Amino acid sequence: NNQQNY
Amino acid sequence: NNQQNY
Numbered sequence: 046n047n048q049q050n051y
Numbered sequence: 052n053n054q055q056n057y
């Protein structure tokens with residue numbers, strides 16, 4: 046799983 | 052932000 050918070 | 056992968 047991937048979560049990216051820019 | 053929230054991501055939960057059960």
Ligand SMILES: [Zn+2]
Pocket residue numbers: 050051
């Ligand atoms: Zn930011």
Ligand SMILES: [Zn+2]
Pocket residue numbers: 056057
């Ligand atoms: Zn699972």
